[PDB]
């Protein structure tokens, strides 16, 4: 049971394109989420009786910046959390969430960054996906660009989403060219590059750091969706992905029995294991999310309805759907986020509203 306990509206009236709970917060500290929209990022604290305590924002000096996405990590030496933000200017900002100071930034991308993700096992490895058709992997410890995943066989239009698998050995990306593409980062070459990125200190050498140019995916398919693929997530070795066709497909590369690590780039088949249908979500840039454990799946649609899927069933097609509505919630939900313990679900909207659902 989720019940709606509170809502609010940010003062800029622009779309909130993203929301992330900090899953690296300390034991005993209150639960905290960031929202991104307009040219800002804002942090809030969850307290009892549905209260959403407004903390502090970071506002970009450029009036024309528009933040699209954010991701949490932490400093690897001090335990302290960090929040990365990015959007239309194609600039990644690493923000100290306590003071909201911009610690540092990365340029390179030829255009808008549509999503950011951190590696599940290495808090320094930041993946950005761009409107310039490419993904980039950054080491935010040594401030190095580890690799660009692109080229003619990479995406031929905007990359909209990507996700590391559980161990962070491979990436799956999706975008406007209707395709989902796989990029392994556990090859000798990539493990070497990450290692070399850690040994790099510009003060102690003469060389620039050389990026990898990865121009070939380890698998590709245009067979799942017939429009823009705007969100992707690993579910073990299986994939969850959506287009703007009111469906989330659960699928895998190759045939039913094929091992994901034995899939070759020539692979021609995919296997569909289920599809979760819903209504009125035919605009693009609409992201579902999952809880920490991947027991559930949340997606908002374009008229303010929420869909939650219970994934704690023995095959993906057996997922149990439930819905959450509120008569005052009628604007489009761009993204959802669960607290780490899944007691709270947050939805953020095109009219700048923030909706809080408690279990």
């Amino acid at each position: 049971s989720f019940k709606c306990v509170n809502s609010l509206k940010e003062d800029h009236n622009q779309p909130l394109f993203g929301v992330q709970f900090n899953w690296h917060s300390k034991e005993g500290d209150p639960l905290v989420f960031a929202t991104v929209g307009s040219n800002r990022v804002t942090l809030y604290e969850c307290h009892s009786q549905g209260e959403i305590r407004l903390l502090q924002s970071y506002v970009d000096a450029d009036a024309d910046e528009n933040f699209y996405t954010c991701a949490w990590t932490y400093d690897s030496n001090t335990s302290h959390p960090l929040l990365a933000v990015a959007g239309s200017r194609g600039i990644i900002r690493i923000i100290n969430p306590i003071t909201m100071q911009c610690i540092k930034h990365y340029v390179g991308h030829g255009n808008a960054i549509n999503e950011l993700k951190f590696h599940p096992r290495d808090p320094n490895l930041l993946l950005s996906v761009s409107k310039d058709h490419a993904l980039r992997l950054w080491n935010i410890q040594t401030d190095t660009l580890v690799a660009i995943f692109g080229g003619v066989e990479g995406h031929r239009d905007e990359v909209l989403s990507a996700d590391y698998d559980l161990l962070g050995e491979k990436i799956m990306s999706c975008g406007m060219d209707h395709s989902l593409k796989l990029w392994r980062i556990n090859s000798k070459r990539m493990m070497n590059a990450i290692k070399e990125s850690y040994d790099y200190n510009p003060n102690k050498t003469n060389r620039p750091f050389i990026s990898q140019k990865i121009h070939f995916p380890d698998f590709s398919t245009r067979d799942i969706h017939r429009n823009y693929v705007d969100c992707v997530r690993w579910l073990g070795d299986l994939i969850l992905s959506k287009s703007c066709e009111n469906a989330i497909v659960c699928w895998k590369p190759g045939k039913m029995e094929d091992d994901i690590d034995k899939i070759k780039p020539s692979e021609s088949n995919v296997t569909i294991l289920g599809r979760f249908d819903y209504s009125q979500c035919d605009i693009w840039y609409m992201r579902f999310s999952t809880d920490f454990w991947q027991k559930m799946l949340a997606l908002g649609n374009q008229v303010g309805k929420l869909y939650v899927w219970d994934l704690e069933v023995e095959d993906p097609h057996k997922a149990k759907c439930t819905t959450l509505t509120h008569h005052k919630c009628g604007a489009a939900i761009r993204q959802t986020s669960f607290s780490r313990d899944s007691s709270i679900l947050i939805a953020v909207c095109d009219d700048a509203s923030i909706w809080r659902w408690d279990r």
Binding site: P15, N227, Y228, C244, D282, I283, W284, Y285, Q302, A332, D350
Partner: peptide, 5 residues
């Protein structure tokens, strides 16, 4: 495909 309605 539109980004918004």
């Amino acid at each position: 495909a539109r980004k918004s309605t």
